[PDB]
Amino acid sequence: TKKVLIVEDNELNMKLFHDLLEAQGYETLQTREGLSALSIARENKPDLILMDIQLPEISGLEVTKWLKEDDDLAHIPVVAVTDEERIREGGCEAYISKPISVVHFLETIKRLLERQP
Ligand SMILES: [Mg+2]
């Protein structure tokens, strides 16, 4: 079972993302803070990180920089939730905007998570 770490401070968004991912058979890890996301990523080794760029305490792009600078976390694909240019240059594999399209969201995640070795 693949694990997705969701970094989102808003309760409603966190719940939507969790529900959608769980319905696909994925397990989720959850946090509202950027620094904690880094700690959780090392402790659990998620397969993908969904990160809200507009966190209240820190920029998601700065958190992504720390991720890419860590040899054990750099390979984990990061999908930004919000730009397209900044996010790409920031190290994120894809971007999802709100109001989010359920199918676009799931297709994006699945394409990154469900590939052959
Ligand atoms: Mg936010």
Side-chain angles (χ1 to χ4, degrees), residues 8-10 52 54-56:
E8 169 64 69
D9 66 297
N10 186 271
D52 163 20
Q54 291 77 55
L55 290 170

Side-chain angles (χ1 to χ4, degrees), residues 87 90-94 96-97 99:
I87 276 59
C92 300
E93 261 58 329
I96 301 176
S97 57

